[PDB]
């Protein structure tokens, strides 16, 4: 099947800037490429027919071009209403295929995340569970690395992460990282650590606690 590689993964711009999104085809597909925009909890909206043909109702700031393997979607003067997902679609070969999509996000000042760690509650512990929660809030960019350490040793198993959408107000991101252990395992270790690494600084933010003590 035809692999459509869209790049970059995410594009951070400021309203007014002129940007272009790339979509590379795994095989020559002539001019059989179309562009779609999809905003939060909304369905895909057609933007460009066959590499560069215009669609009625679509603002003029949108334009497309390309052929063969490389295609490009351009937006003259980005508007606040343009932020969202953009996908290219191959209708040259079968089965038709979509690219991985490019996220157009609004750029803002880098912000360091505020980190907090929480030990399992007594109620969960009574139930035989032990979730250690870590909140990393209001940061930018979204790229961030969180590591868990149990008695100084990094722990990767049992970790589930969740990120919020870019805040429609302060344009930041927030994330939740949860290390889920059984009470049995939780009570066999002493220190628990949530360590976050974000581009805002080369020094990791560390939040930790030691069981029963405090």
């Amino acid at each position: 099947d035809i692999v459509l590689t869209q790049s970059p993964a995410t594009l951070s711009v400021t309203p007014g800037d002129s940007v272009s999104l790339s979509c590379r085809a795994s095989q020559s597909i002539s001019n059989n490429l179309h562009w779609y925009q999809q905003k939060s909890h909304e369905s895909p909206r057609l933007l460009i027919k066959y590499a560069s043909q215009s669609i009625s109702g679509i603002p003029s700031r949108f334009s497309g071009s390309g052929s063969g393997t490389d295609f490009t979607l351009s937006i003259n003067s980005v508007e606040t209403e343009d932020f969202g997902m953009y996908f290219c679609q191959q209708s040259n070969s079968w089965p038709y295929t979509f690219g991985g999509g490019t996220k157009l996000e609004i750029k803002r000042a880098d912000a360091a995340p505020t980190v907090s760690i929480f030990p399992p509650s007594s109620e969960q512990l009574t139930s035989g569970g032990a979730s250690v929660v870590c909140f990393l809030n209001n940061f930018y960019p979204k790229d961030i690395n969180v590591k868990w350490k149990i008695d100084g040793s990094e722990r990767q198993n049992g970790v589930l992460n969740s990120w919020t959408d870019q805040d429609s107000k302060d344009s930041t991101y927030s994330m939740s990282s949860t290390l889920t252990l059984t009470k049995d395992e939780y009570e066999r270790h002493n220190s628990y650590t949530c360590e976050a690494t974000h581009k805002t600084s080369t020094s990791p933010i560390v939040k930790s606690f030691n069981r029963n003590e405090c």
Partner: protein
């Protein structure tokens, strides 16, 4: 022209997922129509389409598991996908073959889990992270099904500085958390309660942090 999908939003593994697309402002005969699904992580899949006459083409990854049909009379077309698995969980859309018109889309979840009220746990600070100008509290909503749950703080009077995260699948059950940050000198003096409503299970629980 106006499209609209309809059908069960929850199907069991091995069973058949069926959906309907009701067309408006045109006849299914005077055009070609398709079915598109979106998997988590923004992965779109062109499932297949049916012609103006009724001819059909399917995506090989769906290998005869799929079936598209139509009814000129009622001016609707259909989608059937047999023996589904959790991997078929997704948002399903019906749109004109050209991508010209789309339906609002509809979510379908494949799971054998039964309705389960969530466990709500209060997330209070470690006695050592209470020395800043602000303090954040939390609430862990764990082991519920199906989605969604509605979470608020102090019955909604507390909304600024709140971060409620998308739920994730833990053990075939959903888990979600929320944080709230307030001026440190006001807690615990000015109480903060986590409120969690789960309509599917007709439940609602309040846990004072």
């Amino acid at each position: 022209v106006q499209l609209q999908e309809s059908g069960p939003s929850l199907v069991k593994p091995s069973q058949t997922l069926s959906l309907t697309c009701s067309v408006t402002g045109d006849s299914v005969t005077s055009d070609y129509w398709s079915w598109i699904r979106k998997f988590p992580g923004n992965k779109l899949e062109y499932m297949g389409y049916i012609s103006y006459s009724g001819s059909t083409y399917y995506h090989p990854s769906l290998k005869s598991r799929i079936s598209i049909t139509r009814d000129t009379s009622k001016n609707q077309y259909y989608l059937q996908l047999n023996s589904v698995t959790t991997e078929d969980t997704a948002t399903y859309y019906c749109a004109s073959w050209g991508g010209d018109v789309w339906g609002a889309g509809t979510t379908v979840t494949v799971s054998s889990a039964k309705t389960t009220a969530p466990s709500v746990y209060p997330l209070a600070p470690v006695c050592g992270d209470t020395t800043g100008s602000s303090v954040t509290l939390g609430c862990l909503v764990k082991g519920y099904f199906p989605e969604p749950v509605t979470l608020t703080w102090n019955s909604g009077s507390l909304s600024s500085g709140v971060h409620t995260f998308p739920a994730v699948l833990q053990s075939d059950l959903y888990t979600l958390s929320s944080s709230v940050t307030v001026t440190s000198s006001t807690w615990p003096s000015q109480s903060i309660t986590c409120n969690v409503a789960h309509p599917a299970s007709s439940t609602k629980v309040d846990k004072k942090i």
